Ligand SMILES: CC(=O)N[C@@H](CCCNCc1c(COP(=O)(O)O)cnc(C)c1O)C(=O)O
């Protein structure tokens with residue numbers, strides 16, 4: 001197995017910080033390396049494995065569809081597509097009744113940004129500082145992190161960034177020339193920073209007032225992650241465009257921009273598209289994923305465990321800890337120093353896999369099926385490495 | 388079944404022209420609608436089913452990897468990824484030895500454009516008229532079709548288009564300002580237009596002389612479609628970045644940007660990325676797809692049937708036929724009127740699903756495993772419908 005690791009490391013583009021280990025398989029919220037070591041996976045593929053590694057129903061759906069049909073374009077209707085369509089819209093407010101399936105989060109936002117422009121005839125986009133929307137050039141344009149943007153300038157214009165949760169700043173940025181505002185109900189890559197009810201409320205009201213669209217990015221907070229099916233249910237607001245990805249396919253590269261009918265209706269024929277978007281395999285996976293989510297109301301696990309976990313974290317007697325924040329099982333542990341050293345130690349010394357969300361934040365995105373015994377172990381592990 | 392169709396038609400964004408039928412399963416180059424009818428699939432997942440619908444090896448690989456692990460990021464090495472990397476670079480010339488995996492063709496080109504700006508420090512992009520690179524804002528900027536860009540402007544600048552196959556045009560276009568040239572060895576969406584040896588040759592020579600990068604988009608021409616493993620093999624040139632997708636994963640959403648190490652090396656850590664890009668499910672399907680292609684040298688079938696198919700089409704006695712062209716099984720039949728009505732007859736009266744490559748061109752992108760008898764049947768259907 002040493003050869004594969006070296007092959008991946010050597011042949012990789014080199015843009016990634018790869019860890020010295022080879023993960024071979026997973027079940028639930030546990031994963032194993034090539035040497036047999038077992039790990040608690042709070043990385044869960046960056047919040048993709050919400051339903052847990054090896055979710056039977058999803059796996060089964062993927063097997064049966066792979067045998068039946070995998071390649072079929074949007075020009076040729078195929079059963080799983082129609083099913084995914086009504087299956088996804090049925091768990092959303094009736095207003096969001098139109099879907100443009102894609103293959104990733106960045107593509108979903110790319111779709112949002114484009115439909116927004118075709119519909120309004122406006123060009124400007126408003127986003128929040130420390131907001132992450134994707135790496136493709138359109139999505140990168142509304143992505144704040146300067147170092148992620150500067151080397152590839154110029155990108156799509158014009159875009160205006162406003163401090164996250166700053167209601168008055170939002171109010172002043174959005175005008176009649178604004179095509180849309182794009183925000184995350186809880187900023188992920190930006191440190192796990194939950195939106196305030198007033199901020200999102202303001203974002204909703206402002207946009208309708210100026211004729212701008214509201215694009216809510218639930219690519220990371222979606223699929224029960226925050227405690228409810230979607231975090232926008234926490235704020236009582238309903239967007240014009242909702243973008244989803246990650247856990248949407250239960251692992252299969254899947255994403256979608258769901259929007260109001262008048263919005264989708266303004267898009268000219270052949271005005272946008274995608275080869276893979278809406279393929280039968282991804283459609284069969286999403287159907288399965290959504291049905292498991294709803295059948296088990298998996299968001300409840302996150303609502304119950306999220307608080308308990310964060311409470312334990314806030315109990316760790318360590319002066320290096322600034323704050324414990326998040327919603328559901330989307331948690332961030334902000335330290336008063338670099339988080340990287342501790343993450344490396346959680347892995348090597350405690351077989352615990354965690355992510356970052358900015359240099360001083362240890363982020364936890366465990367499969368929602370994770371058990372309380374593993375949560376206590378994570379806490380213990382953290383207390384340990386910080387001592 | 389009628390429920391699932393109206394549902395798909397009704398809940399879709401509406402940017403696609405959908406055919407009146409519902410495809411349920413496929414095998415080889417045959418597909419079945421919901422009423423039990425069988426079709427010869429000249430659409431092939433839109434050039435994605437090169438290895439045949441239901442290809443045993445790919446299906447098998449997907450089923451087994453789905454049971455093992457599907458979600459795992461680029462920061463955590465995983466066996467199938469390491470394998471995909473070495474298996475892919477192994478079927479390519481030695482200069483293309485670095486891999487940046489993604490989830491679609493457009494993502495592939497976006498990464499190509501980005502790595503190009505990061506490497507040359509330049510900004511200008513040169514593309515060809517009738518060229519197609521993708522729908523995401525970045526790829527859309529180097530895509531020709533005015534009506535595809537028109538309503539989404541302003542996009543990424545600065546971009547210069549030159550007439551396809553115009554050597555002197557391209558030469559005057561590429562300067563010390565150019566980060567890269569992006570071209571398809573054979574324009575697909577642009578109506579199936581093969582490059583000439585002299586043109587691609589100049590693109591390689593000019594780019595090197597001027598220090599700009601050559602991006603060869605083989606997303607549609609790749610994986611044996613034109614008669615050889617990759618279309619560049621016909622021309623004896625090696626680009627700086629090679630973008631793939633469509634058939635690369637036997638059906639599973641997958642694409643990739645393969646580049647020379649100096650180009651990969653210039654990308655700052657975390658300068659680019661993707662959640663799904665390089666996921667184990669796609670990596671395992673990509674290994675299987677390539678092994679199958681290499682074991683059967685599948686491209687020889689296109690190389691053998693392609694010319695034999697194109698001459699059969701040309702020999703049709705219809706004054707409506709203008710020209711027949713293509714490479715291997717990437718074929719386009721241009722008529723002296725609108726194709727759409729004819730494609731409709733092909734479907735309704737002959738159970739033959741085909742595509743367009745512009746309003747007057749019928750395009751064929753059949754699985755490479757298609758039988759000769761099925762191609763003979765196709766020709767008869769075309770002759771019949773044009774009477
Ligand atoms: C039915 C549909 O949606 N059609 C797509 C087109 C699909 C086929 N072309 C893809 C393609 C692409 C874009 O690849 P992707 O994102 O569709 O996977 C890039 N380069 C070349 C040479 C290509 O042929 C569209 O209109 O956007």
Ligand SMILES: CC(=O)N[C@@H](CCCNCc1c(COP(=O)(O)O)cnc(C)c1O)C(=O)O
Pocket residue numbers: 016046104105106107109132133134135184188189217218219220221245246460461462657659660661662663
């Ligand atoms: C190491 C790596 O590749 N990580 C990615 C980031 C992954 C997680 N973020 C995804 C994301 C995206 C982009 O989605 P996708 O293309 O990765 O599927 C959009 N919106 C929100 C709220 C998101 O959280 C990167 O560095 O580009």
